[PDB]
């Protein structure tokens, strides 16, 4: 089986084009992930800045919990001023837990973006390696079809065939080309090669979809980070006051117990 009819030549031509288009279309699709890498890196910087900016609030909250733990040890954590202080600070405690949780979610999303991007890249590279080589195999038949005992129409079609598709490929178009070529004896020797090219295309493309979805979830977590970071910073002065007050309460109960022993 060489390509002897115009129909066989055209099905081979279209396939060779689509296989060669795999690397070009996938590079285009891959390049859409760079904006997501930039976004996640930007989230990480913003988180590091928020972590600095909230640290005085966090320090005050730690001081409060330290003093409360000591009041609980003394059996005096039911002191009405302690109770009042704990009420006053509970929203900030809750906001700190949310900041920790949403920042973690942002950072996991960041990790996942890079991982999906690395897989998209490797998928692209495998797809190109396979696609370019399978297209070369087809071109053996196409070039042979320019000469010999095929029809004049077969030879002319082979002469006309360009290396390149005029538009982007896709899972559907590549598969369409492969399926059309299933009818053609000489091309059928490479069927498994064609399959593996398509599988790598799918994998790369799916990884790019995962980058985009992951990055969208990341952004929504980051909005919550930004909201709660501001609430913590805003509470910093009242948290420092609360820490001093409960320290005083705790110190009074310490000295009452010392002086009573």
Author numbering: 37 to 297
Per the authors:
haptoglobin forms a stable complex with a haemoglobin dimer.
Here, we present the structure of T. brucei HpHbR. containing the corresponding region of TbHpHbR (residues 36–299). Ala89, Glu123, Asn124, Asp270 and Ala271 no longer forming hydrogen bonds. hydrophilic residues around the kink site in each of the three helices.
